[PDB]
Amino acid sequence: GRKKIQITRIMDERNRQVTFTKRKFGLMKKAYELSVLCDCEIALIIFNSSNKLFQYASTDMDKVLLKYTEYSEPHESRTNTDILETLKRRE
Amino acid sequence: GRKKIQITRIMDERNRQVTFTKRKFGLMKKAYELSVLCDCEIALIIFNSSNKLFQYASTDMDKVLLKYTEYSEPHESRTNTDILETLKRRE
């Protein structure tokens, strides 16, 4: 962008909403690209701060959800806290 | 990148695995930024071609998924063909 922005909650309401709309599309675009390039199944679920739902899925959301609730082996499980710690070690 | 790539399945198996590892992190990083910048809650399910699970959640995976199952209102739902057609018609 015209400026670097800190990764912290955008305080201006309108800018938070505009950013939300644009970055949500960019994330869904990158999910679509990852699913085609690497032949994977991806489901993305977003609740905004008003608890409105936005969903993406590379194919059938319900089958991916079902297969998720049946998984029993350990697996990569990241959250914001882990990601933030990963980025702190790289910068 | 050094070259543009078309969004089609990477057929060389080692390159597909490298691109997968790298772009999965970038996707999770962008999800972390979206959730922090815009104060939203995100769940991300990824199954690779060998049906192995990789997951990200901004805070609480199963909480977000459970909220999703109880959401009855009409909401935006995107698929790969939706996104590919949004991208194609941007010309």
Place this chain on the structure above:
DNA sequence: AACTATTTATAAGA
């Protein structure tokens, strides 16, 4: 595992 030359994303400007 890193680097880097390019492409892609997007913060602001218009």
Place this chain on the structure above:
DNA sequence: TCTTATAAATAGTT
């Protein structure tokens, strides 16, 4: 609505 300058991601290289 729609560019544009700039930041970020990443494909191919080392």
